[PDB]
User: Fold Thiol:disulfide interchange protein from Escherichia coli K-12.
Amino acid sequence: AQYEDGKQYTTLEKPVAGAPQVLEFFSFFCPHCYQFEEVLHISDNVKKKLPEGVKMTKYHVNFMGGDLGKDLTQAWAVAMALGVEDKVTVPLFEGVQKTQTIRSASDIRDVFINAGIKGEEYDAAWNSFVVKSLVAQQEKAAADVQLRGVPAMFVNGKYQLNPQGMDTSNMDVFVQQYADTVKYLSEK
Assistant:
């Protein structure tokens, strides 16, 4: 076939019930994640090709960058709770990987302040049990698929995208193949 298990995707031997339709994992420490966000805009091109009725979920992971890695997962929870993902994603990536000015939880906070979120609102969110439970969700979703690498995308908790099985001559063509693959899997 044109799409083949083990080539553009793999099947989880242990399907995850009740999983989000399109579930993406990343880390601000993850160099291909940076490319995926800044250069390729994968998440955005996937959405443009997804059906009607399909929600997209994106979670941060703990296993990169030790203590700061965990801070970043909590910060991403704050971003989801406040609905400010699209304002902090780029400065967090650049602060961690480009300028390397994110070295503590306080520096993470600075990124949110500079993006216009008020200190009070940030600190209240950061310490909230709503964010606590949002951190729990991120961990449990990653735990469900025993995740040891990012970037990763899973469709309906049973298929996992396999970008190594796609040509990277052309960045545009790679993205469309990736997105078309998500669409196919979606309709599966």
User: Anything to note?
Assistant: The helical segments are 31-39, 42-47, 66-82, 85-98, 105-114, 119-127, 129-144, 171-187. The chain has one domain: 1-188.
